[PDB]
Structure formats: C-alpha cells, structure tokens
Amino acid sequence: QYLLEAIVRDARDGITISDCSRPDNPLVFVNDAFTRMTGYDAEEVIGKNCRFLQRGDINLSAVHTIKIAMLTHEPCLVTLKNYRKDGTIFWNELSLTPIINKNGLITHYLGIQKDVSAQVILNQTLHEENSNKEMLEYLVNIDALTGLHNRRFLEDQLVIQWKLASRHINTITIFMIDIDYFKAFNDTYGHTAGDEALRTIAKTLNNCFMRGSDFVARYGGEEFTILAIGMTELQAHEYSTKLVQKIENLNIHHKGSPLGHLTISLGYSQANPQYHNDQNLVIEQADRALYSAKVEGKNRAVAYR
Amino acid sequence: QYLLEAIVRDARDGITISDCSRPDNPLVFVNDAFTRMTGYDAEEVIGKNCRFLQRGDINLSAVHTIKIAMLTHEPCLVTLKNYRKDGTIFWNELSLTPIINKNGLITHYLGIQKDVSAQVILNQTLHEENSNKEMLEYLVNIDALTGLHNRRFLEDQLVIQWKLASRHINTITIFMIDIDYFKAFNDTYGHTAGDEALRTIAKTLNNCFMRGSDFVARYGGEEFTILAIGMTELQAHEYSTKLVQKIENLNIHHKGSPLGHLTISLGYSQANPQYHNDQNLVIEQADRALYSAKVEGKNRAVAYR
Ligand SMILES: Cc1cc2nc3c(=O)[nH]c(=O)nc-3n(C[C@H](O)[C@H](O)[C@H](O)COP(=O)(O)O)c2cc1C
Ligand SMILES: Cc1cc2nc3c(=O)[nH]c(=O)nc-3n(C[C@H](O)[C@H](O)[C@H](O)COP(=O)(O)O)c2cc1C
Ligand SMILES: [Mg+2]
Ligand SMILES: [Mg+2]
C-alpha cells in the first residue's frame, strides 16, 4: 500500500522532513498537523531551520542533545518547550531519526512533533494532592512523586519490547540508576528535600532519550530504570556516562557525599533478545553492575561485561 | 523517500491496518506503538477485530459511529475508553480512514490510536478549581467550563485550515450550534444546572467527528462551533442532522422548552476556500443559517444555501 504514506501524512502529530545536504538542516517538508500544532504555514517555514519554535526559556541540555545527535548521525527523543506563531506555549516531544536509503547515510532527517502539554501539566500536578476514578486508572502506571512511569510499566514494557526486539533483531539495554548517599541527604537536609531532589533527578533523566520506544521509570524509592532499544555498545556507554554527568552538573549540594554534590551510580547491561530470550536476566546483570559501580567510582557507569 | 514509510511506522501512536475484503475487518498489520500502548503483541491480534480493547463501559454512540462509517466507507474520528491486556485503562482517540488505490475503493482501513488519557483527565479537572504558570499557558486555548477549545483556537485554526484546504482543494464547513431556550433552563432549573447541561452537551459534541482535523469549540456562553474539512454536501447534512438528534436523545428534561427536552439549533455553511478565499464569510453565513434554524424547526439543522 503506497497511499498509506499519504494517509499517515494526514496525522495528528507533526511530520517534518529536513534536508541534510544543505547547511543548518532546512525544513523541506511540512504536513498539515505541523501547521495546525504550531500555526506556521508551509510557505513560511520551508527552507528554514525549525529553531523558530524555541525561545530563551528552552532547555539548553535538550537542544544540545539535538545538536550532538544530528552531528553524530544518531536519533534522539527530547521534550521541548515550543512557542506557536500566535505566542501560545505547547510542550513538544520531538523524535528525530535519520533516513538511510541503500547506505545513503543521513540524506534527510525525520522530525515527529507530539503535543504532550497535557501530560506535562498533569504529571506535574500529580506530586501535589490536587478521588476521580479515571485519574486513579491513570495513576496505576504512574509514580505520584516523580511523575514518571512506575515499576509495573517497566516490567510490562520489558515483556512487550523484548518480543518486539527479538523480531527486528534489536538490542535491549537496561540502566539501573541509584542515588548515592541518599540516606545522608534525607537525614541531614530532610526527607522533603530528598523528595525534591528525587523530582529534580527524575525530571533530568526523563529527557534526551535516543529513540521513541525508550523511557525512564522509578524502580524504587531511590532507584530509577531506563529501557532502550536498538543501541550499540558505544552508544550505551556514552548515554550512561552522560547521564551520570548530567546529574553531576545539576550540582545539588550534598553534605554527606564526599564529592560535595549528590551523584548517580549506574549499572547497565545490553543483550540481544533474539539469542537467549531470557527475561529478568538483563535486570539481574544490571543490578550486579550497579553494585560494582558503587565501589568502582560512586559517580560512574559500569557495564556488566 | 520510501524508507520514510518504515521510519514513520516506528511512531508513538498506534498504527493498524485491517483488511476489508475479509468479514469483520480483521487486523492485518500492527506497528510497535500499538503493542506498547495496548500490551497486545502482533501474533495475538493479527486476523482479529480490534474490539478486544472495548468493554461494557464503552460509549455506545462512538462505536455506532465507527460501524456506520465503515459501512458507508467514510472516515471517522472517535474517542474511546479502551482496556489494555493487563487490565489498565487508556483513552484512545481513534482515527479511521479508508484506503483507495486507483479507485480500488476501501481495500483496507487505517486505524491510528493516540493515547489521550492525560488530556481527558486534565480537561475534566479544568471545570473544577483544582496558579501554575504552565497550566495557565494551557488554559489560553481551552474553555474552563466545558473543557473544549476556546474561540481563539477556532479563529486561528480557521486561518490555518483555510490555507490548507485551499492547497488540497478541500471543503471547509462551519457548524454554528446554539442551545434552545437556554435562559429558560437557567431560570427554572438553575444556573449551575445550566453549566452541567453545557458540559453534557459539550461532551456529546466533542466526539464522533469525521476526520482528524475536525474539532468543536465553545464560541459563546451557550454557543458552540464545529470546523470540518473535506466533507461533501450530503455528509455535512447528515452530520449536522445527527448532532441535533444526539442532543435530543440526551433527553435532558427542559420544562421551558415546548418539546420537553433541551434541543440544539444548528446552522452550517460549506464553502470551497480555493475559489473565493474570503474568511469570516462562512461564519457569517453559518450564523444567518442558525437564525433561520431557530424559527424553521427549533430542533433542526439548516444549511445556508
Ligand atoms: C526535522 C527537524 C525538525 C525539528 N523540529 C523541531 C521542533 O519542532 N521543535 C524544536 O524545538 N526543535 C526542532 N528541531 C531542532 C532545531 O531545528 C535545531 O536543529 C536544534 O534546536 C539545534 O540547533 P541549534 O542548537 O543551533 O539551535 C528540529 C530539527 C529537525 C532536523
Ligand atoms: C483498523 C481498525 C482499528 C481499530 N482500532 C480500534 C481501537 O483501537 N479501539 C477501539 O475501541 N476500536 C477499534 N476499532 C473498531 C473495532 O474494531 C470495531 O470495528 C468497532 O468497535 C465496531 O464494531 P462493533 O460495533 O461490531 O463492535 C478499529 C477498527 C479498525 C477497522
Ligand atoms: Mg542509594
Ligand atoms: Mg440560545
């Protein structure tokens, strides 16, 4: 079905195509959903870089992840605060993906914009009290404190995405994240401040993913977990290293930590689900790597190898 | 770009293809986003009708709109309450669209599932008090009482979709909806009950659209407006008639109304934006048709002809 391309083109998420042969990656195609979501007609944006949606309040770390990914010819999934032409604000989960036809590497770039404004505002109001049956059905797979997905969402997605990865021969990578000296932060600074530090770390981790299937969840009271698909070994090592550095650059003053700032120990394990098809083995390996990452660096990512 | 089909296939909204040559319209294709959103692997659903997501609490009017649209070989946009395989609940805005290749009418059907759970729960909590800067930025284009889009969203979309319709030679149809004897409902029953009747009518109108670009907005205190694209004259007459009948079937007891139940006067006007390119003319024509619909039937849809 070739018309399927044209019918999916008329979607509710923005679809943009940008030429990579030309400098600054100008937008070469814009669907109807993009103009409806942003207010910018196609005649106004064709041949221009899509940074007009950004303003001075944009997350510098997310835009930097976009730039690095495009220079390294790698996909990325970021959540951005974009402004429409009228001046209104909408939260955009942008997925960038290269286009490679017969080794024609990165001929163009695919940008899928999804209006996630309601999700951001609702999840932010979840840590406050703010009863409703439909709200409780939503909170089943959402942690109230951080607003991220819960351990149930991780384990269910682990089964689903394992079957999907074994079909397309894609890798499955699980990152076990633990806060260092968290009991010292709760005893000295306070338990409420530890919850505020949990939110700040959660908000920092829940961005700058590599692909749309990837996500972060809160596994324990101080533990987080990230699931990623289709990453090589080098990309997994860089992604895990940069995550530990991002929490370090937050520089939340921790008196109990010998480093002076709260850090993150990361232990990740990558596996090919098509070979062994053994679930929960990756989590066990990632938890053993997290244990090794505690004493090895206490502010580092250790791969179970 | 032919790989663009495969890259868009890996989206965050579910993509399903169903064969129409076979009875009950069995699902013939399922993307990764569908299994992640619903928990149903492809091996479990291929060759089956997608009604397994529905349960006894599903909106009967929305499922009936799906059935009628598929039998009439027409697209539809409905919001449904679907259940995942694990038992959790997610709100699904499903867009169905036929596939016609070289007059190969309705060879298959395209089903795009979009998780709009957060949007439903947030907009429902908007009529309650429930401050936040980001929430106020969202409430710019949202009416607090009904939860629908506001008059600003309608007028801006009217400019955007007018340019889009003139590009693809698509029709633009505007429906002017007004509540009959609304002051009699507020005086006798009460102003609060009139607001509850506004929500019930708004919740009924904000569903069972024909295409993903269509929407409903609250134009005035008792006035609603619907924008639709690509509808013929017969489809616009049936859609406007069925909307007046849906509010009538709600049967909210109105003592001041001679019919015994509150009704809806509808005055719609369809135009081809490529010809005249005169905005606000359709709204003026639709408002004159609404005035004629008041005295002509008081519970009918009148087309400005
Ligand atoms: C196809 C494509 C679509 C894009 N769409 C958006 C967008 O919708 N919102 C946004 O904030 N950035 C978007 N960008 C990213 C910006 O255009 C820009 O490349 C990014 O901000 C990095 O550039 P800069 O660091 O020089 O500002 C898109 C990029 C590409 C390639
Ligand atoms: C391609 C396609 C995808 C569908 N996906 C869903 C869905 O995700 N959720 C849902 O409630 N109904 C979905 N449906 C509609 C149901 O499969 C079914 O056709 C509809 O409920 C009407 O059938 P019924 O009245 O006999 O139950 C889909 C239909 C088609 C053709
Ligand atoms: Mg710890
Ligand atoms: Mg009236």
Author numbering:
A (entry chain A), B (entry chain A): 4 to 133, 138 to 312
Describing publication, verbatim:
Here, we characterize a LOV-activated diguanylate cyclase (LadC) that offers precise temporal and spatial control of enzymatic activity with an exceptionally high dynamic range over four orders of magnitude. The blue-light sensor used in this system is a light-oxygen-voltage (LOV) domain, featuring a canonical flavin adduct upon blue light illumination. Here, we present a blue-light sensor coupled to a GGDEF effector domain that features exceptionally high fold changes of activation upon illumination. The name of the latter domain refers to a highly conserved sequence motif in the active site of GGDEF domains that enables GTP coordination and eventually diguanylate cyclase activity. To establish this pronounced activation, the enzyme exhibits a two-stage activation process in which its activity is inhibited in the dark by caging its effector domains and stimulated upon illumination by the formation of an extended coiled-coil.
The structure was solved by a combination of molecular replacement and single-wavelength anomalous diffraction (MR-SAD) phasing. The pyrophosphate was apparently copurified from the bacterial expression cultures, while FMN was added in excess during the purification process and Mg2+ was included as part of the purification buffers. Visualization of symmetry mates revealed a parallel dimeric assembly of MsLadC as the biological unit consistent with its in-solution behavior. Proteins, Interfaces, Structures and Assemblies (PISA) analysis supports this assembly with a large buried surface area between the two protomers (2785 Å2, ignoring ligand contacts) and high free energy of assembly dissociation (14.2 kcal/mol). Overall, the structure reveals a characteristic LOV-dimer interdomain interface, comprising the A′α helices and the core β sheet of the LOV domain. The structure reveals a tight interaction of the LOV domains with their C-terminally linked GGDEF domains. In addition, the inhibitory interface is formed between the surfaces of the LOV and GGDEF domains. For example, Asp44# (hashtag denotes the adjacent protomer) from the LOV’s Cα-Dα loop forms a salt bridge with Arg174 from the GGDEF’s α0 helix, and Glu77 from the LOV’s Fα-Gβ loop interacts with Gln242 from the GGDEF’s α3 helix. The buried surface area of the inhibitory interface in the dimeric assembly amounts to 3073 Å2, as calculated using PISA. This interaction interface, together with interactions within the linker region, explains the inactive, “switched off,” dark state. S7C, the MsLadC dark-state crystal structure superposes well with the MsLadC dark-state SAXS envelope (χ2 of 0.999), confirming the crystallographic assembly as a functionally relevant inhibited state in solution.
